[PDB]
Design goal:
Strand order of the largest sheet of chain A: 3-2-1-4-5
Largest sheet of chain B: none
Protein name (chain H): Antitoxin FitA
Oligomer: heterooctamer
Number of helices of chain B: 3
CATH topology of chain A: Rossmann fold
CATH architecture of chain B: Orthogonal Bundle
Order of helices and strands of chain A: EHHEHHEHHEHE
Order of helices and strands of chain B: EHHH
CATH superfamily of chain A: 5'-nuclease
Number of strands of chain B: 1
Number of strands of chain A: 5
Subunit structure (chain H): Homodimer in the absence of FitB; forms a heterodimer with FitB; 4 FitAB heterodimers form a complex that binds to fitAB promoter DNA. The complex is also seen in solution.
Largest interface: C-D, 40 and 24 residues
CATH topology of chain B: Arc Repressor Mutant
InterPro entries (chain H): Arc_rbn_hlx_hlx (IPR013321), FitA-like_RHH (IPR053853), Ribbon_hlx_hlx (IPR010985)
Pfam families (chain H): FitA-like_RHH (PF22513)
Distance between the termini of chain A: 17 Å
Number of helices of chain A: 7
Strand content of chain B: under 5%
Radius of gyration of chain B: 19 Å
Helix content of chain A: 40-55%
Shape of chain A: globular
CATH class of chain B: Mainly Alpha
Keywords (chain H): DNA-binding, Toxin-antitoxin system
DNA sequence: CAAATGCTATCAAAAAAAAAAAATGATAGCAATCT
DNA sequence: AGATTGCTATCATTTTTTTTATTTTGATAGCATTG
């Protein structure tokens, strides 16, 4: 029950990817790692926003043929129930001084509905929403 | 690749045919999927290395 | 079918609700109106953020016991397919000028999939998404 | 709002023309009414006025914007 | 075979458009079908005669 | 309601149609008269067994555009529920000395299902199947 | 899908069921086998006509509490549309000598609409109906 | 019966060859098995034997012709 | 009256048929392996 | 050394996919005639 956040799933794709995060992703059981539609939408947009060239085209190729097919069946949707969670999480934090970006809240509420562990670089937002978190930039 | 399955129990065949149609697939596609899922299981994908590869291949990117 | 964006569903609940908008909502047949999960979220949070008192308790009840139930089964989730659409609706608008805010992209993208018409006061964005839009704040002319 | 109906059974036409004459209306007026009548039937609830009430019950609200 | 309906309440129009799509048919087919049903309800067919004639119309048959 | 046995619904078409039967069919409220798919099957077959020609062609035309459309929605299917009834109806009558043709059985059963009064010139069978009967060859 | 006629489903219940047939029935996926309301009518009538006693009673229960329920949702009715097929299956047979009886027509007709295969011991008739048949009593060869 | 599976990705294919080898059998024997187990799983009820039992329970019955 | 009717029209998009291309389901034929 | 297995191939369908006509809606525009 692990839910990758945008910044995590996209770390290995970067120029100087953090090897600690790659190693961690390499220690997981794919059949136990999820993605939020909101997160997939952010990835797909990231690809789509690239200037046209061989780069954008191969990336898209992979993104759809190699990467995304690995989570097929586990790309969680943001629905009505989850929308209620979102409201609680965000309204709560906000009225107690901690801000939670809508972007984050979406993932948070999702993780929160299936008691999943959000994996992310910015743990503040999630500790606040009362959601198990794991920063893969560390050890343990 | 092609593969021929002969001497297939009649029932086992009826059953697969059933699964296929009951899911709107041709029997052939059904078997193809089945064998596909099995391969899928047998395999342990290396998520971290998988991506970092695709990234090193395309000069790396930053999807925000 | 029509997809109501947050700001319309809110109009009637306001102090001096624009009459033209309320008139248009009544000229509608419920079973035709849909809401995006995103929008429900917004509504649900907009309520949660009010100072604790009587007003917020009632609104919260009416909200969950009256309003929303009326859209049961017609609340559209932001699923994986919709994401793909979202990806294009936004990259497109950008490499064309008018950029779209993610939230608005979710709604547009959702609407587009099912080729629905978005009812919003802020149409200025959606039209750039190649989705049909309608402003109930405005008058109808149609040819 | 106007709409045409071509290839309307000639029998149906007379039947409607008849019903209209029976009542004191024009054929168009009769169509308008047999139409408007079923429409009002589909109208299970009036969303506008519905939400308005909720508004009046609480003296009206002004939800925060919340949207980048 | 042709009729024009004008000054039609944009809303009644909505209601119809709706019942139309829900049954997978054009709005027009809908009116056509509605009017058609009205006519049928306004009509009283005399089953005996109606057949007795179709009968004499073809020289008589037996089933 | 009223279910028309095959012989009644087809009398008017016969060469020298019996006027008492025609006049009674004329006193009925169409919206209360039904047909069994079984009966509709024999009607249609009756038309099919005619030598291709104007007669057959027109009879067919009329049978599909003018007659059956009048019963649209009131043509009762022979289903499981009915099948059970049919089995009781025929078993009883038969193990009592009154043969009930499987033909008539299907109707009597359809009728006994929704509580209808069958119209037929063969009253004898139906009385034995415990179903309201009416002989349109008589009066009242 | 497969439509079982009366005689095939009757076999297993007999004194000395036909080995080959039973085996065949055994090689099927229940949810693929169906029954025409007609055939169900028959099976029930066949039961009802027995002499009163233990056998009849037991068999009755087995029929209603065990057999038929396995076919719930798969017992095909003889509805208006099937009737059209019917009229044509029989007419076409008469104009080719080989006559088809009403009962057989009903079953055939049903099968044809849903484009199924009739499993009967008397394929004799059904072939003239222009419908696929299969005799579980016979064997299976090449194509 | 027989069946030919065309357009089977070499990946899946190699996966199945491996499986078979590891399992000590031929690929055609492996697929035959893989399918068999699946089929065994769908076989909820055995209509013949099921009906047979009933027959055996009442000592067989000969049902009147009727048709 | 001007507004309302009853008919015929326009006219640019949506909403059966003819042709072209895949797959599917059944075997059929061999050379190279195992029993 | 006869059965099994691995690979291709033939072939009469089904099933799709793509093209190419035809119909139908939408929506509202003329025109001569009653609340």
């Amino acid at each position: 029950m692990i839910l990758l956040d945008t910044n995590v799933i996209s770390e290995p794709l970067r120029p100087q990817p953090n090897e600690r995060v790659v190693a961690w992703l390499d220690s997981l059981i794919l059949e136990d790692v999820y993605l939020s539609a909101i997160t997939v939408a952010e990835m797909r947009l990231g690809v789509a926003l690239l200037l046209n060239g061989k780069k954008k085209n191969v990336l898209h190729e992979r993104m759809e043929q190699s990467i995304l097919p690995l989570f097929a069946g586990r790309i969680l949707p943001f629905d009505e129930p989850v929308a209620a969670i979102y409201a609680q999480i965000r309204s709560y934090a906000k009225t107690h001084g901690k801000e939670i970006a809508a972007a984050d809240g979406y993932i948070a509420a999702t993780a929160k509905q299936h008691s999943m562990t959000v994996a992310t670089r910015d743990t503040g937002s999630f500790f606040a929403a009362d959601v198990a978190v794991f920063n893969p930039w560390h050890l343990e | 690749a092609s593969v021929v399955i002969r001497n297939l129990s009649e029932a086992t065949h009826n059953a697969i045919k059933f699964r296929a149609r009951a899911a709107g697939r041709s029997t052939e596609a059904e078997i193809r999927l089945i064998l596909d899922n099995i391969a899928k299981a047998q395999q342990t994908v290396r998520l971290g290395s998988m991506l970092a590869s695709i990234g090193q291949e395309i000069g790396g990117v930053e999807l925000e």
